[PDB]
Design a protein around this ligand. Structure first.
Ligand SMILES: COc1nc(NCCc2c[nH]c3ccccc23)nc(Nc2ccc3[nH]ncc3c2)n1
Length: 291
């Protein structure tokens, strides 16, 4: 019942029909909470796309499925993984996207230690994405290294908008417990009204990732972890002594408990740390095929 209503409504926001006629050779690449990710060929062009497949009867918060397919429709940015189409397919939602051949930043922060020139390249990239999105009131809400995908030549693109959100002059804030626990902003966990700032904190956690190789409290269970994010002063770097005051000073602007005081993406684009940012050819050596 609530399923057919939900189904009918989603129909209206995706593209009509069935993409199986023109997509061949599904190759699974990833699994997530919402479902699996594949690559495919478009028969007419030879081109590769990535297809996210989300089972309608298998979500937590089913109605989250409305967000990306509307908010990101025809969204065009060089640091954003473009979304081509969505469709309803069986009891499944498929989102068809740009293929990013280099994999996620996760592989890199787990297997090596990025220099500051590379960390600023990633940070510029993501903030150039975040400022354009925030200036239209779009909130990513799942910023972490998994959402950072790469091209063969080391260009960085923000991805994974499944948890995203739209705010307006008339609903300027959200209140929903979404994200990935160890990355979640203090206020978010707290259950308070929040804006795009929750993304800046999150990016701070990602910087800890690129420096330390893991976020704070990664060992402690998610439930208890979350608690400590709300209750405690911002987390510091294990490898503090490994980082410049430029980098630390830059981090000190993202990990601010009070979101009012926390820098915005627009503010952060002017920060001196970002003068360090390497060309996208400084990232190439970090990638798996090139190690
Ligand atoms: C939440 O779980 C999850 N896992 C993965 N796997 C990332 C692996 C990946 C990303 N690019 C790759 C190229 C070759 C081999 C692996 C990769 N990818 C995604 N999402 C995703 C979204 C857009 C994408 N565009 N291109 C790949 C891609 C993956 N989600």
């Amino acid at each position: 019942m609530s399923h057919e209503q939900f189904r009918a409504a989603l129909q209206l926001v995706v593209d009509p029909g069935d993409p199986r006629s023109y997509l061949d050779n599904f190759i699974k690449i990833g699994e997530g909470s919402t479902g699996i990710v594949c690559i495919a060929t478009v028969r007419s062009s030879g081109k590769l796309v990535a297809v996210k497949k989300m089972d309608l009867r298998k979500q937590q918060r089913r109605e989250l499925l409305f967000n990306e397919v509307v908010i990101m429709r025809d969204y065009q940015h060089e640091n954003v993984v473009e979304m081509y189409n969505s469709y309803l397919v069986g009891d499944e939602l498929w989102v068809v996207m740009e293929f990013l051949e280099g994999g996620a930043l996760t592989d890199i922060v787990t297997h090596t230690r990025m220099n500051e020139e590379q960390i600023a390249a990633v940070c510029l990239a993501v903030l150039q994405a975040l400022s354009v999105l925030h200036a239209q009131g779009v909130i990513h809400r799942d910023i972490k290294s998994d959402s950072i995908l790469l091209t063969h030549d080391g260009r960085v693109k923000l991805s994974d908008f499944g948890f995203c959100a739209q705010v307006s002059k008339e609903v300027p804030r959200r209140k929903s417990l979404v994200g990935t626990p160890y990355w979640m902003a203090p206020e978010l966990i707290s259950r308070l009204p929040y804006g795009p700032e929750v993304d800046i904190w999150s990016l701070g956690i990602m910087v800890i990732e690129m420096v330390d190789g893991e976020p704070p409290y990664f060992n402690e269970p998610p439930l208890k972890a979350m608690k400590m994010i709300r209750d405690n002063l911002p987390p510091r770097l294990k490898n503090l002594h490994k980082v410049s005051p430029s980098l630390k000073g830059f981090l000190d602007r993202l990990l601010v408990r009070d979101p009012a005081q926390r820098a915005t993406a627009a503010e952060l684009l002017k920060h001196p740390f970002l003068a360090k940012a390497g060309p996208p050819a400084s990232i190439v050596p970090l990638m798996r095929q090139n190690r």
